[PDB]
Amino acid sequence: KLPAPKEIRTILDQYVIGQERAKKVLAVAVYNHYKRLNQRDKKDDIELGKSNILMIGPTGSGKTLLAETLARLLNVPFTIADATTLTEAGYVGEDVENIIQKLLQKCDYDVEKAQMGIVYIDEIDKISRDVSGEGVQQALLKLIEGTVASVPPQGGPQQEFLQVDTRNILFICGGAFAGLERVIQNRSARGGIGFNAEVRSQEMGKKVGEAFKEVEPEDLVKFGLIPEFVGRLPVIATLDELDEAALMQILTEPKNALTKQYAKLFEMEGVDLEFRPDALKAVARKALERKTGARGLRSILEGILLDTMYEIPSQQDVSKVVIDESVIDGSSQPLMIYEN
């Protein structure tokens, strides 16, 4: 109950590796949000307005993880609804109502739980700029600020529809705004081309290191988002790119680190899973070029472990499997101590 922002930060830090800026923002944000649901006394202090957050980070930065991990600290219904599916009324496509509908399915159709729920609408950037654009934004505007639910009944007339007010729920929004770096580059040192220009470092996961630190509402409006929409979300969180230095600190440090999980499965048979410092770094580089980041580690690792994971059980007396940098690439095979 109402854990201190610092405690939340430490718990979230267990998995997240290097999101301090957003960590604090997200921590304080939820902390005060639930204090409003808690501070319901009648002392002329119910007027308090919620403040929705707008998480902007390159794909795979850790946005979803923060939302999901934080949901567990709350121990209440949480959901993630994509923004692409939603389309303005009058044309085929998901209706804004549906967001509440699916959200309530996780809540078990409990009004108290609904009001104390958190949303993580993703890919908000997609709906930028007659249909699938401003229309969706206009509809969403009312929904995020204030609206009554119309969720039809489950299982089993038209009056059966249930209602709940969308003025308590914290509607967090996560989006990978492709091109925002150029908008923020126009703020100062607009030069992209020329000898004395700010030409991008590279076309790898180094580009957006701290490019969103200087994100202002004006840029988001220029991006295409409605001015009103940008106003609705006052807080704007920023995430890093999870580059090679991050990926090296994310393959063993996290409590859920792939190496740890893989080691657990290997430990059962009796093989002491081992990794070399350079070996782990090698995987990071391979994931960055592949552009799969976080999601590329598992696959990459499975391509380097599964091979010997089908052998190890049939082999006996195995004591260790040393994974060398060479093994990561397609040159060598996992070194294994066949006997003791």
Partner: protein, 191 residues
């Protein structure tokens, strides 16, 4: 033919010409003989970029063999009149009217390439008429010559007498020689 490029902005995909795309990044191209028509386009570009952001710097590439003195003066006076600093990066060659604009850039923002050549010579003029008319025009061109020498002395910092002697005849200066002379501040080699 001028190639076409696509910005691919968040708003939507728009087609810009190679020159306009660079113009968006505060880059103005000065190519060919200087004349009233081309020079006014540079003036218009500078004024347009001024309103967008008077604080941000404007880049101006100069590769020209010279031309009209009056046309060039409008560019020089416009660069100083506007608030933002107009950086200059000489590519190729730089003749008398060309080098008077390169030296008119903000201090510390004047550059040139390794194989660039900068030349400075007396103003060229011509006229046909009576003796009285010749005497009038002769004084005007002579007066104009003094102003150009003073401009170079102000930016370069060299004595006015030295500028006159060097400008008496054609003098070619390389990137290294220009830095010592004061025409520029740095010679770009690699990124």
């Amino acid at each position: 033919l001028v190639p076409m490029v696509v910005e691919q902005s968040a708003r939507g995909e728009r087609a810009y010409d190679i020159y306009s795309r660079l113009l968006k990044e505060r880059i103005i191209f000065l190519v060919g003989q200087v004349e009233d028509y081309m020079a006014n386009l540079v003036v218009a570009q500078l004024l347009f970029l001024e309103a967008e952001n008077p604080e941000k710097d404007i880049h101006l590439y100069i590769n020209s063999p010279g031309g009209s003195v009056t046309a060039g003066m409008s560019i020089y006076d416009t660069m100083q009149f506007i608030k933002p600093n107009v950086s200059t990066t000489c590519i190729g060659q730089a003749c008398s009217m060309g080098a008077l604009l390169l030296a008119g850039g903000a201090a510390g923002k004047r550059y040139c390439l390794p194989h660039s050549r900068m030349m400075i010579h007396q103003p060229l003029g011509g006229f046909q008429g009576q003796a009285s008319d010749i005497e009038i025009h002769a004084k005007e061109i002579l007066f104009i010559k003094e102003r150009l020498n003073q401009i170079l002395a102000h930016h370069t910092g060299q004595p006015l007498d030295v500028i006159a002697r060097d400008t008496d005849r054609d003098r070619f200066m390389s990137g290294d020689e220009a830095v010592k002379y004061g025409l520029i501040d740095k010679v770009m080699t690699q990124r």
